[PDB]
Amino acid sequence: SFDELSKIIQKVFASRKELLEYDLQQRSQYRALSTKCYGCASAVTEHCITLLRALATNPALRHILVSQGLIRELFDYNLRRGAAAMREEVRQLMCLLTRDNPEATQQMNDLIIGKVSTALKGHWANPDLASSLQYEMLLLTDSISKE
Amino acid sequence: SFDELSKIIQKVFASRKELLEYDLQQREAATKSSRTSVQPTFTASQYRALSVLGCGHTSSTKCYGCASAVTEHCITLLRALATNPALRHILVSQGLIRELFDYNLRRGAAAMREEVRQLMCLLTRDNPEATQQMNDLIIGKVSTALKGHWANPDLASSLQYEMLLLTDSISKE
């Protein structure tokens, strides 16, 4: 159904363009003369992740970004969603963001420990609670890996 | 693999039974030949116990399936026993509701889940204190989930059973 709709939309767009060109012929600046796209938003997120990973290299930029508090946003929203490669890249970016910032390392460790303890509180009650801790553990392992 | 192992185990059990039967027959014949050896008459219970009849009537000790069957039978029995109002009050005093919500609420087959929900509803049929306790537990779990709602899609994903139980409880006037 999506393929059929896309083909119909392309044909309609072509017809509208032809009609507009005919009407204009009858009648920088010369060159001049979707929002709810989940895929587009995901691509924007991936590009932003790549750009942040790049900008992380400048240590002063790293301190500035840490001041911006991007660590909490990354852990909260982008940590789990997205592709597996996106997940690995995000883990790498989080590691790099805590390259040598002791306060940042403390904050990240605090967040991870808090999530783990909150899960462990209801461990006897919810198997899914244990199931939904994998990403945090992988992040901790990755952080420990980088000396 | 399980099928092959089961077939092998069954054959082995059969062979062991036959060998035990032959050895016991030989031993009994030897005892009978001994004139000094007096034949021990066995009471019916003793005969059944000593018989090779009581050899293959159990599952494995750590048989998850056997434990599950035991749990299902227990659930059915408790659902039945709940009928007597005094029995209901006594069971609520035993505090079964917490265990039922904690462990047996989610696991098991769909029919088991529906039966557990029905039993939970029945247990709080008219006990105001029990109804308050169950509502408190449900609301607490829901609020705890909602606290991290903005962060965990799985948290939202893991509240269906509680909501179904609440709907069922509201259903029975």
Q: Three-state secondary structure along B113-131?
A: HHHHHHHHHHHCCCCHHHH
B139 to chain A nearest CA, in Å?
15
Nearest alpha carbon to residue B101 among B117, B118, B124: B117
> Cβ–Cβ of A132/B151 closer than 8 Å?
no
How far is the C-alpha of B109 from the C-alpha of B72, rounded, in Å?
A: 10
Contacts with B148 from chain A: Cβ below 8 Å: 118
As given in the structure block, the two tokens for residue B93 are 């005093």
Q: What is the resolution of this structure in A?
A: 3.4
How far is the C-alpha of A48 from the C-alpha of A82, rounded, in Å?
A: 13
Q: Which of B102, B150, B157 sits opposite A125 (nearest CB)?
A: B102
Nearest alpha carbon to residue B99 among B125, B66, B123: B123
Q: How was this structure determined?
A: cryo-EM
**How would you classify residue B40: left for phi > 0, otherwise alpha for psi between -120 and 50, otherwise beta?**
beta
Let me know: does B134 contact B142? Beta carbons within 8 Å: no
Compute the radius of gyration of chain B from its Cα atoms. 27
As given in the structure block, the two tokens for residue A38 are 């989940």
Question: 3-state DSSP call for residue B95?
Answer: coil
Count of beta carbons in the 10 Å neighbourhood of residue B140: 10
How far is the C-alpha of B33 from the C-alpha of B4, rounded, in Å?
A: 44
Let me know: does B88 contact B125? Beta carbons within 8 Å: yes
Q: Which residue of B has its CA nearest to A123?
A: B102
Q: Is the dihedral of CA B8, B14, B15, B17 positive or negative?
A: positive
Nearest alpha carbon to residue B171 among B133, B89, B163, B104: B163
- Dihedral angle, C-alpha A139, A76, A69, A38, nearest 10 °: 110
A77 to chain B nearest CA, in Å?
7
B151 to chain A nearest CA, in Å?
6
- DSSP per-residue letters across B22-90: HHHHHHHHHHHH-SSS------HHHHHHHSTTTTS----TT-HHHHHHHHHHHHHHHHHHTTSHHHHHH
Q: Three-state secondary structure along chain A?
A: CHHHHHHHHHHHHHHHHHHHHHHHHHCCHHHHCCCCCHHHHHHHHHHHHHHHHHHCCCHHHHHHHHHHCHHHHHHHHHCCCCCHHHHHHHHHHHHHHCCCCHHHHHHHHHHHHHHHHHHHHCCCCCHHHHHCCHHHHHHHHHHHHCC
**A115-A117-A121 Cα angle (round to 5):** 120
Amino acid letter for position B74: C
Chain B interface, Cβ < 8 Å to A: 102, 148, 150-154, 157-158
> Cβ–Cβ of B154/A124 closer than 8 Å?
no
How far is the C-alpha of A15 from the C-alpha of A40, rounded, in Å?
A: 26
> Cβ–Cβ of A126/B158 closer than 8 Å?
yes
Interruptions in chain B after residues (C–N over 2.5 Å): none
B39 to chain A nearest CA, in Å?
58
Contacts with A125 from chain B: Cβ below 8 Å: 102
* A88 Cβ contact partners less than 8 Å away, ≥ 6 residues apart: none
A135 to chain B nearest CA, in Å?
12
Contacts with A80 from chain B: Cβ below 8 Å: 153
As given in the structure block, the two tokens for residue B167 are 């709907």
Q: Which of A124, A125, A132 sits opposite B152 (nearest CB)?
A: A132
A92-121: b (≥16 Cβ within 10 Å) or e: ebbbebbeebeebeebbeebbeebeeebee
Contacts with A131 from chain B: Cβ below 8 Å: 154
